[PDB]
């Protein structure tokens, strides 16, 4: 093979990033925090429901 797709820094960055598992989990946790604590709990829970 004359060209290796695994030789580019993009592949290197993706591998060193742990397959972006940290990014995915952090985005999901941020979405949960935004939707639950502020929106669902404090706003819909305390301001509205309570």
């Amino acid at each position: 093979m004359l060209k290796n797709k695994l030789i580019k820094f993009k592949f290197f960055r993706f591998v060193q990033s742990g397959f972006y598992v940290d990014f995915i989990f952090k985005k999901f946790s941020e979405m949960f925090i935004r939707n639950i604590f502020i929106y669902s709990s404090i706003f819909f829970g305390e301001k509205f429901m309570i």
């Binding site: 993706f14 972006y20 598992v21 990014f23 941020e30």
Partner: peptide, 19 residues
């Protein structure tokens, strides 16, 4: 509160697709 050092990836769906 949280750190996203992989800001080159735009969104969670886009990041998952790229991964």
């Amino acid at each position: 509160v949280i750190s996203y050092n992989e800001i080159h990836l735009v969104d969670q769906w886009k990041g998952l697709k790229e991964s």
